Scaffold this active site. Structure first.
Site, PDB file in Angstrom:
ATOM      1  N   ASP A 179     -16.715  -5.397 -33.118  1.00  0.00           N
ATOM      2  CA  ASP A 179     -15.766  -5.552 -32.009  1.00  0.00           C
ATOM      3  C   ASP A 179     -14.568  -6.440 -32.412  1.00  0.00           C
ATOM      4  OD1 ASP A 179     -14.691  -5.446 -29.458  1.00  0.00           O
ATOM      5  OD2 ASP A 179     -16.610  -6.174 -28.574  1.00  0.00           O
ATOM      6  N   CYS A 213     -15.534   2.670 -26.861  1.00  0.00           N
ATOM      7  CA  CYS A 213     -16.109   1.506 -27.504  1.00  0.00           C
ATOM      8  C   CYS A 213     -16.680   0.665 -26.382  1.00  0.00           C
ATOM      9  CB  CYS A 213     -15.151   0.776 -28.449  1.00  0.00           C
ATOM     10  SG  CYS A 213     -13.510   0.677 -27.668  1.00  0.00           S
ATOM     11  N   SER A 214     -16.451  -0.626 -26.450  1.00  0.00           N
ATOM     12  CA  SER A 214     -16.935  -1.419 -25.330  1.00  0.00           C
ATOM     13  C   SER A 214     -15.946  -1.368 -24.093  1.00  0.00           C
ATOM     14  CB  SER A 214     -17.254  -2.817 -25.883  1.00  0.00           C
ATOM     15  OG  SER A 214     -17.810  -3.575 -24.738  1.00  0.00           O
ATOM     16  N   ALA A 215     -14.648  -1.657 -24.346  1.00  0.00           N
ATOM     17  CA  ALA A 215     -13.570  -1.536 -23.342  1.00  0.00           C
ATOM     18  C   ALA A 215     -12.893  -0.161 -23.297  1.00  0.00           C
ATOM     19  CB  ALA A 215     -12.489  -2.509 -23.790  1.00  0.00           C
ATOM     20  N   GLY A 216     -13.043   0.561 -24.417  1.00  0.00           N
ATOM     21  CA  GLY A 216     -12.364   1.877 -24.457  1.00  0.00           C
ATOM     22  C   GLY A 216     -10.853   1.849 -24.894  1.00  0.00           C
ATOM     23  N   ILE A 217     -10.509   0.808 -25.673  1.00  0.00           N
ATOM     24  CA  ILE A 217      -9.111   0.617 -26.105  1.00  0.00           C
ATOM     25  C   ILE A 217      -8.978   0.155 -27.559  1.00  0.00           C
ATOM     26  CG2 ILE A 217      -8.187   0.248 -23.793  1.00  0.00           C
ATOM     27  CD1 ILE A 217      -8.107  -2.723 -24.269  1.00  0.00           C
ATOM     28  N   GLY A 218      -9.819  -0.796 -27.954  1.00  0.00           N
ATOM     29  CA  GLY A 218      -9.507  -1.371 -29.278  1.00  0.00           C
ATOM     30  C   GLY A 218      -9.779  -0.450 -30.499  1.00  0.00           C
ATOM     31  N   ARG A 219     -11.090  -0.322 -30.775  1.00  0.00           N
ATOM     32  CA  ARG A 219     -11.710   0.585 -31.756  1.00  0.00           C
ATOM     33  C   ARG A 219     -11.387   2.091 -31.463  1.00  0.00           C
ATOM     34  NH1 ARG A 219     -17.505  -2.421 -31.996  1.00  0.00           N
ATOM     35  NH2 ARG A 219     -16.984  -2.836 -29.878  1.00  0.00           N
ATOM     36  N   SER A 220     -11.423   2.486 -30.177  1.00  0.00           N
ATOM     37  CA  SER A 220     -10.993   3.849 -29.783  1.00  0.00           C
ATOM     38  C   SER A 220      -9.588   4.259 -30.053  1.00  0.00           C
ATOM     39  CB  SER A 220     -11.065   3.941 -28.261  1.00  0.00           C
ATOM     40  OG  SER A 220     -12.384   3.510 -27.784  1.00  0.00           O
ATOM     41  N   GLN A 260      -6.375  -3.285 -30.384  1.00  0.00           N
ATOM     42  CA  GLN A 260      -6.540  -4.644 -29.887  1.00  0.00           C
ATOM     43  C   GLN A 260      -6.084  -5.761 -30.784  1.00  0.00           C
ATOM     44  OE1 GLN A 260      -7.564  -6.017 -26.687  1.00  0.00           O
ATOM     45  NE2 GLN A 260      -6.019  -4.469 -26.513  1.00  0.00           N
TER      46      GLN A 260
END
Ligand SMILES: O=C(O)C(=O)Nc1sc2c(c1C(=O)O)CCOC2
Length: 296
Positions: A179, A213-220, A260
């Site tokens: 993350d 991902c967890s929030a749906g923004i960084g890794r995605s 992110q």
């Protein structure tokens, strides 16, 4: 992008480049997200779907999920970006996969990261224990999986209990992307992206792939940015006609906060610059990414 890469690097300016992106990015209302009735459907207070591009559940009750359709017009590919399902929205998640007709789900996170529970356990971990989500009347079974050292492909069966129609969903789980981090290398990232592609789940005969991902923004955002840049490059065979930062800005019209950190941005230039060797006619690098990645 490779010269820009070296200019950026030489003069240590990724954060400022990234800062500019954050400053330029769009801002559009997220009013339904912020309805009090939706409070417990959002994982983070500060990460919402804009109303214009949000995915609506086809329920009369409450149509809200924290998910957005990223619809890349030029590249002609969409994705749905979503947060990791919450304990009360795993039924909404699979309702959305059914309704949007997606064939693949990409998960870029672990259920546990930094001591926290980043995502509900929303798929079954074994064949004999199917999940049934009563609220949206859907059943899900593990049909099998293929576990690699850094990711696992699951074949899942999704059943609409009201009509008894059935679909196969493929789940690609990257389990070694930290993350707020980057993948270990461009090789293993492209290795994973190309598994996704070869599977058929990106193809426009399906609904849009679900990426989370967890929030749906960084890794995605990172995954999606790399994928589309490679796509755009491919339909022209013209690497120099891709403007990465500009593509990211296009994507942030449809969901906030995509990518992110400034090392994620920089990793995305690395991945696209490497992947362009493949799009540009050298298919032997694919094999090399597969060796580098240490998949087995
Ligand atoms: O899962 C990701 O790749 C990701 O964007 N994570 C996000 S973005 C983000 C948070 C996190 C987080 O998981 O703690 C916490 C709230 O602020 C923004």
């Amino acid at each position: 992008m490779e010269k820009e890469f070296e200019q950026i690097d030489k003069s240590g300016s990724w954060a400022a480049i990234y800062q500019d992106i954050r400053h330029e990015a769009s801002d559009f209302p997220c009013r339904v997200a912020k309805l009090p009735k939706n409070k417990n459907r959002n994982r983070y207070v500060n990460v919402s779907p804009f109303d214009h591009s949000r995915i609506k559940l086809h329920q009369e009750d409450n149509d809200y999920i924290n998910a957005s359709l990223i619809k890349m017009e030029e590249a002609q590919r969409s994705y749905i970006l979503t947060q990791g399902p919450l304990p009360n929205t795993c039924g909404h998640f699979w309702e959305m996969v059914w309704e949007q007709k997606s064939r693949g789900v990409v998960m870029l996170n672990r259920v546990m990261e930094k001591g926290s529970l980043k995502c509900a356990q929303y798929w079954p971990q074994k064949e004999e224990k199917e999940m049934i989500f009563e609220d949206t009347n859907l059943k899900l079974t593990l049909i099998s999986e293929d576990i690699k050292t850094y990711y696992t492909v699951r074949q899942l069966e999704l059943e609409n209990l009201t009509t008894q129609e059935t679909r196969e969903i493929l789940h690609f789980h990257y389990t070694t992307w930290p993350d707020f981090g980057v993948p270990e290398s461009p090789a293993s990232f492209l290795n994973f992206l190309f598994k996704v592609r070869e599977s058929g789940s990106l193809s426009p005969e399906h609904g849009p792939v679900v990426v989370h991902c967890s929030a749906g923004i960084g890794r995605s955002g990172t995954f999606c940015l790399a994928d589309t840049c490679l796509l755009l490059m491919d339909k022209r065979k013209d690497p120099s006609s891709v403007d990465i930062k500009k593509v990211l800005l296009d994507m942030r019209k449809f969901r906030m906060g995509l990518i992110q950190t400034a090392d994620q941005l920089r990793f995305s230039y690395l991945a696209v610059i490497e992947g362009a060797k493949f799009i540009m006619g050298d298919s032997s690098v694919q094999d090399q990414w597969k060796e580098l990645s240490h998949e087995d």
